Each structure stands twice: as C-alpha cells, then as structure tokens.
Design an enzyme around this catalytic site. Structure first.
Site, PDB file in Angstrom:
ATOM      1  N   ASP A  69     -22.914  11.994  20.172  1.00 47.75           N
ATOM      2  CA  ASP A  69     -22.594  11.605  18.780  1.00 47.75           C
ATOM      3  C   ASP A  69     -24.110  12.264  17.968  1.00 47.75           C
ATOM      4  O   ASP A  69     -25.117  12.530  18.822  1.00 47.75           O
ATOM      5  CB  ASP A  69     -22.497  10.314  18.364  1.00 47.75           C
ATOM      6  CG  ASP A  69     -23.322   9.238  18.517  1.00 47.75           C
ATOM      7  OD1 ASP A  69     -24.306   9.454  19.479  1.00 47.75           O
ATOM      8  OD2 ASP A  69     -23.679   8.305  17.895  1.00 47.75           O
ATOM      9  N   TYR A  71     -27.706  12.789  16.040  1.00 48.04           N
ATOM     10  CA  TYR A  71     -28.924  12.000  15.900  1.00 48.04           C
ATOM     11  C   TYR A  71     -28.916  10.756  14.738  1.00 48.04           C
ATOM     12  O   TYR A  71     -28.232  11.131  13.710  1.00 48.04           O
ATOM     13  CB  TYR A  71     -29.974  13.024  15.517  1.00 48.04           C
ATOM     14  CG  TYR A  71     -30.461  13.939  16.627  1.00 48.04           C
ATOM     15  CD1 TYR A  71     -31.037  13.865  17.639  1.00 48.04           C
ATOM     16  CD2 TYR A  71     -30.324  15.317  16.038  1.00 48.04           C
ATOM     17  CE1 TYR A  71     -31.585  14.608  18.589  1.00 48.04           C
ATOM     18  CE2 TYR A  71     -30.683  16.485  17.100  1.00 48.04           C
ATOM     19  CZ  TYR A  71     -31.198  15.778  18.348  1.00 48.04           C
ATOM     20  OH  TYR A  71     -31.514  16.667  19.430  1.00 48.04           O
ATOM     21  N   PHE A  82     -27.510  18.349  18.836  1.00 53.15           N
ATOM     22  CA  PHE A  82     -29.013  18.844  19.281  1.00 53.15           C
ATOM     23  C   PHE A  82     -29.784  19.565  18.376  1.00 53.15           C
ATOM     24  O   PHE A  82     -31.033  19.060  18.454  1.00 53.15           O
ATOM     25  CB  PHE A  82     -29.039  19.124  20.577  1.00 53.15           C
ATOM     26  CG  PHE A  82     -28.238  18.119  21.584  1.00 53.15           C
ATOM     27  CD1 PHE A  82     -28.613  16.799  22.095  1.00 53.15           C
ATOM     28  CD2 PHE A  82     -27.021  18.372  22.225  1.00 53.15           C
ATOM     29  CE1 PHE A  82     -28.181  15.954  22.705  1.00 53.15           C
ATOM     30  CE2 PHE A  82     -26.360  17.280  22.877  1.00 53.15           C
ATOM     31  CZ  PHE A  82     -26.618  16.265  23.385  1.00 53.15           C
ATOM     32  N   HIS A 192     -26.844  12.724  30.485  1.00 49.59           N
ATOM     33  CA  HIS A 192     -27.284  13.187  29.270  1.00 49.59           C
ATOM     34  C   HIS A 192     -28.684  13.358  28.958  1.00 49.59           C
ATOM     35  O   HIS A 192     -29.498  12.728  29.828  1.00 49.59           O
ATOM     36  CB  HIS A 192     -26.795  12.136  28.068  1.00 49.59           C
ATOM     37  CG  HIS A 192     -27.208  12.266  26.643  1.00 49.59           C
ATOM     38  ND1 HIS A 192     -28.282  12.308  25.949  1.00 49.59           N
ATOM     39  CD2 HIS A 192     -26.078  12.508  25.590  1.00 49.59           C
ATOM     40  CE1 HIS A 192     -28.097  12.484  24.770  1.00 49.59           C
ATOM     41  NE2 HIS A 192     -26.795  12.783  24.643  1.00 49.59           N
TER      42      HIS A 192
END
Ligand code: 5NU
Ligand code: CL
Ligand code: CL
Length: 228
Positions: A69, A71, A82, A192
C-alpha cells in the site's frame, strides 16, 4: 475524480478496457474515499494520483512490481509504488532498501533521488495491492475494496499476448500469485523491502537482473533499470 468520471477519462486506453470488469468498483472506491473525508479521516496519495500507475500504457508493461500500500507519510506517496518526488529526502526506509539491492544486484551507483518515473516510462508497472492508505497508518485501507481492482489489473496483464514478469514484494502482493499462472507470465516472490522483513530474503534477492533474464528467455527486451 474516480467517483465522478469514467475509466475512459481517468486512465490510459488499454487500462480503461482492462479494468472494465471493475468499473463500478472503482467508482465505489471513490465513494469510500469521500466517506473517509466526511468522517474526518484523510488518505494518501492525493486523489489525482491514486490511479497514476494506470496512466502509463497497458500494452507496454513488461515488468510488474507490486507492493503493499502507499507510503503513510504525507508528502511521500505519488501513485507509483515506492516512488517519491525528486525533492524528497531522506528517502523512506523501504526505498533505501530497494536502492541498496539495486546497487548490489546491478552494480550501478546509488540513484540521485527517489523518483522512479524512468522505470514507469520504460514499461515497469509500479503497483500496490491496495491503492490508498490513511496517513500514518500502514495497511489501514486493507480489505476496503481495492483488492478486486488490483486483482483485475493483474488478470488482464496476464491475459495479454505480451510477455510479463511479476515481482511481488510482501505478503499482500503475494496473494496475486494464483492469478499469475499464465504460460506468458512468470512471478518472482520475495519478502517486502521494509525493514520489518527485508532481512528475511529481500536483500540478496536480485530481482532486477532476474527479471531481465526472464524477459530475455521469453524473447522480450530487458528493462533498462538505470536511474540517474
Ligand atoms: O508504494 C509503497 N510504498 C511503501 C510501501 N510500504 O512501506 O509498505 C509499499 O508497499 N508500497
Ligand atoms: Cl487522518
Ligand atoms: Cl476518526
């Protein structure tokens, strides 16, 4: 506005057709975001950026990157997973870890900034499993309706003639794996890049070079991953 305007006017042509099965669901997400604001909660990224990944051409996607999801810090998320605006610093921790792996895998110097638009402009789709988040609260919009939208995006990509390599970062991204089963598609899965998980197998995962080997093996051109 996703509540007010149709996909033909929100996203790129190929994407508007790809996302036709979830047209109503996208409008419903606009209604969800409206209800959040009415209730006194905010969301990120900005409304005009939520569907930004779908403004780069569907038919040109070679590599799909999927995170969790956006930031959670105001001023970071830009609607490409990202990525941050070129003036943002310090970099968010997930991005610093991605860039650490980029340098280790590819041998390139650290990028000058955190703007990943070059990747988007070269056929890398920068998606998240869920496309909004409440400020300061990671995963707060999990299970609120975005998953059907990103599921549809992935099925559509996988159904194209065009080759696809998927990079799935983290557990929520990994729930797309069943949809990626197509002969023309191959998936790389890792933990992740967040500090919470990166040491479990993100570092050393070499996703960029692996993706290029997979593209070349299906007769496609590799991605130029080099950032300035
Ligand atoms: O666009 C993204 N920004 C941040 C993260 N993350 O911190 O989980 C992510 O998964 N995707
Ligand atoms: Cl809030
Ligand atoms: Cl509240």
């Amino acid at each position: 506005s996703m509540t007010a305007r149709p996909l033909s006017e929100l996203v790129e042509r190929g994407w508007a057709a790809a996302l036709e099965p979830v047209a109503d669901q996208v409008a419903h997400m606009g209604q969800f975001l409206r209800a959040e604001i009415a209730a006194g909660r905010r969301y990120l990224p900005a409304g005009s950026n939520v569907l930004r990944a779908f403004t780069f051409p569907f038919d040109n996607v070679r590599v799909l990157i999927v995170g969790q999801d956006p930031y959670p810090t105001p001023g970071h998320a830009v609607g490409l997973s990202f990525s941050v605006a070129p003036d943002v610093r310090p970099w968010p921790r997930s991005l610093a870890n991605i860039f650490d792996e980029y340098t280790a895998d590819l041998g390139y110097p650290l990028p000058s900034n955190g703007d990943l638009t070059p990747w988007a402009q070269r056929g890398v789709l920068l998606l998240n499993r869920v496309l909004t988040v409440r400020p300061s609260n990671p995963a707060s919009h999990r299970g609120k309706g975005w998953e059907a939208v990103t599921e549809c995006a992935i099925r559509a990509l996988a159904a194209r003639a065009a080759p696809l390599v998927a990079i799935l970062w983290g557990r929520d991204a990994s729930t797309l794996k069943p949809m990626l089963a197509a002969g023309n598609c191959v998936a790389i899965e890792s933990p992740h890049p967040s500090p919470l998980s990166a040491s479990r197998g993100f570092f050393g995962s070499r996703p960029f070079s692996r993706a290029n080997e997979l593209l070349v093996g299906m007769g496609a051109e590799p991605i130029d991953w080099r950032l300035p």
